[PDB]
Symmetry: C3
Subunit: 364 residues, 3 copies
């Protein structure tokens, strides 16, 4: 009976049929990350799969499965894909390329999973009680509940809304917040670990500048509600500015616009008129009484007629005559006034010689 020790070394071509049992394969070809110790340096990888927490992996302190692909041999250029062993689901990629492929020049790991990016799904829903000062990593988050903004801290407004964080660096953490109801849009920055105040955008829902007065519209003629007239300050006047009415006696006026009315107000009379010649008259125009006078030559013991300087308008009321000469006192030298009309009267001379007699008459 033949034993294995009798069989010489064979070329792989001697296997002409069948599929090898998986245990016959090097472990990396079964997907087992067990060919090298779990602290192996991925920089010196020569098998296509290892598991290691070595520092040259993508995240210091963490184990990653590291796939390697090689050209032109397992010591040469390589591409590596790293996937996480626990805690999170992450992927990284890197490459070594060099003119002498065996003297590797590794580039830094580049992240593949979208955990390293701004994602089309929000990073998370914010629960209650969140202090936005604690949101210091880049991303965007949704607060779906106004009451959870109320129970949190450093929200710019008590409203559901969208938070963006742009963590530029440790000393410049930018945030924006868009309120769900458009209350406004806010922004702030943590600068060297101290937060600036939120800035609140002014928008068209807040106010319309057309509701406010331009400086160019601020002037007297534009001011509505102005009264037609204004209560005056103390002032004097020229009498010319008195243009209607009639001043009464109570104010030192004559209470009339006619001379007659004025005279009645102050109880005044009118001027008398006269012609005060040798033959003359005088007239009281208050009453119309007229007195007249003249002289006449009379014959001895006889009459002479006189004509009054002016006619009496209605009648002569009376008269007398007087001897103007040095009549002989041994005889009568009587006089008479009689027969008066509106225009004439008769003067009687009782003296026994031609004589000049003066006379007076009165009437109306």
């Amino acid at each position: 009976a033949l034993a294995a020790t009798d069989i010489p070394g064979l070329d792989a071509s001697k296997l002409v049929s069948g599929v090898l049992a998986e245990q016959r394969l090097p472990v990396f070809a079964r997907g087992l990350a067990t060919a090298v110790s779990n602290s192996s340096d991925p920089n010196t990888a020569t098998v296509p799969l290892m598991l290691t927490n070595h520092a040259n992996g993508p995240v210091a302190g963490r184990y990653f499965y590291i796939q390697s692909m090689f050209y032109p041999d397992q010591n040469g250029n390589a591409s590596q894909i790293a996937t996480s062993y626990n805690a999170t689901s992450e992927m990284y990629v890197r490459v070594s390329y060099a003119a002498n492929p065996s003297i590797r020049e590794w580039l830094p790991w580049q992240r593949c999973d979208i955990g390293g990016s701004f994602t089309k799904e929000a990073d998370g829903e914010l629960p209650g009680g969140v202090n936005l000062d604690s949101m210091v990593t880049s991303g965007w988050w949704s607060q779906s509940f106004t009451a959870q903004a109320a129970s949190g801290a450093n929200y710019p407004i008590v409203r559901a809304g969208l938070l963006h964080v742009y963590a530029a660096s440790s000393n410049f953490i930018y945030q924006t917040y868009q309120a769900y109801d458009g209350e406004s849009f806010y922004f702030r920055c943590r600068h060297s670990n101290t937060w600036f105040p939120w800035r609140r955008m002014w928008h068209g829902g807040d106010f319309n500048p057309s509701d406010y007065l331009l400086k160019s519209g601020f002037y007297w003629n534009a001011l509505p509600g102005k009264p037609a007239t204004f209560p005056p300050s103390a002032h004097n006047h020229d009498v010319g500015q008195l243009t209607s009415g009639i001043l009464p006696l109570a104010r030192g006026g004559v209470g009339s616009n006619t001379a007659a009315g004025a005279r009645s107000t102050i109880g005044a009379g009118v001027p008398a008129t006269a012609s005060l010649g040798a033959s003359g008259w005088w007239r009281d125009n208050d009453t119309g009484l007229i007195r007249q006078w003249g002289q006449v030559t009379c014959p001895a013991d006889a009459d002479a007629s006189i004509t009054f300087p002016i006619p009496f308008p209605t009648l002569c009321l009376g008269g007398y005559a007087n001897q103007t000469s040095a009549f002989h006192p041994g005889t009568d030298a009587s006089t008479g006034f009689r027969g008066a009309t509106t225009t004439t009267a008769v003067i009687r001379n009782g003296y026994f010689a031609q004589a000049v007699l003066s006379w007076e008459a009165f009437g109306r």
Copy 2:
């Protein structure tokens, strides 16, 4: 003479040279995703490559190729990379780690292709006719034509511009729009399937607050255009405030500032004056007429001189005398008045005895 049945079981070390035909390999080592049925659970994977649409894959209802990497054996902890079988090009990663590695604890799948991210390339160009209410998927899009905004619906402004969509959830869809010409920046949100109005940012192109009147600038002294004088409302005056001019008769005045002028205006006379004693005088100061009177003791049949109480300024015009006694009526008792100057006259007594005669004279 040797057939295969004569050869004993061999150790893999007996293959000392050559490269196996790939058909000798388990199918997963050939890139063939055929080792397990295409509905197999990736959670229970033990081969490094499978193809399955099982629900525990990354996208519901879709086939993915799933690569698996294991430690410390194929039943233990694992890392998996899923890649799509059709429709789109997508990649995912996940991991199972457990203290007892055979009791797996899988973490959620994380996406790797940039389809899950906001990318440096815009998501698309918006054509004409787009209703922005329909843009409810996260991303950013560009409208390159104002005319294509004009043919659409629910653009905040008819302008080319940049649309961001942040679909936090179907209950909260946020949008922003930046007009290409800086007309403004807009934001809004769809809450519970109803869109709030676009909010429009106010910016420096719209207005400058310095053009508007501050409340603190609104007061009487600052109001420009105020008139120097104002139309007065109805008011009363004291006559003392009439400081110039002369009131005319039409207004109840006397049309003059002199006594004589005032009398002229109202046609008034002046007072008569008198001394009304037993001998006396009376003067009409309107005309200048003077009447005087007195008494005189005359000698029998002779003259007596009289002196007028006051001189006549110019001349005596006339006079008479009257017997004051009970003269015997059997003789003449005539009288005469004659020879009058401005100061004196001659009274003649025709009675045969001494007698008292009264007299009157008038003149001017």
Copy 3:
């Protein structure tokens, strides 16, 4: 001794123990990308690993390692993962699916690393001297120093701050800038290689609209500081608005509110009164002088008493009588007036017949 040429072809099941030397594996199972040439076409891939710069790879001109996973066989549907060979660390994925799997239909390569995405890490820190017009690639950058903004160009404000770039297309490059201190938020766009000016957001740190006057608050009654009285413009009055005071003669008044005082001011007299009948009286009310007259029938050579029309208030100053008839001139016809009281007097008739004598009397 047996030679290898004596051993017949063997089934893979003849290996019952041990692990193959890795050099017995097809090269791709070792991670060696050498099974096909570096010009091989990935569209026609039948091996699970290659390295090629063929045009059908993900980036023209560049070598990528390409893994292939196949179903149902190596000519059929396939998923491919490509990882970079040099220069950078990049990954892509694609797929071929067709109802007839051998007539392949390849979908476009899709990037898997975050290098083509908006990353949670900022693209970079801006140094000094940067012209922001040069930043036309999508991303976000941080200016950590205000002094480095001051040395640059086309910053919207000389302030540290956060720059975003959205390069929608060559014809539209959008930028936003958030100041670190919240000075404001800015945006602009480069359209057809011309940058619009930055727009500057108005926010609550800039001003508050409640400091400005609403047009609805701009009216007369609301204006503060208004005087209580106003200097009047020229106006006229009705004398009815002269409610107090007494106009003096200097202003055309009578200087009094009594008739007597007004007369005194202008030196006017009062009206005379009279009863100008056949017998009657006349009275100068300036002085009180009264004149009266009448007629009386006397016996021959005898007295007759008269009663004055009215009593003299104080005394009769004088009188006379006059013959009214054509007395015989051959005799005496003297008259007398005497014995006057306030009410009566005595008229003497020296004519030797009954005769009518008229009389006058005066007094006060």
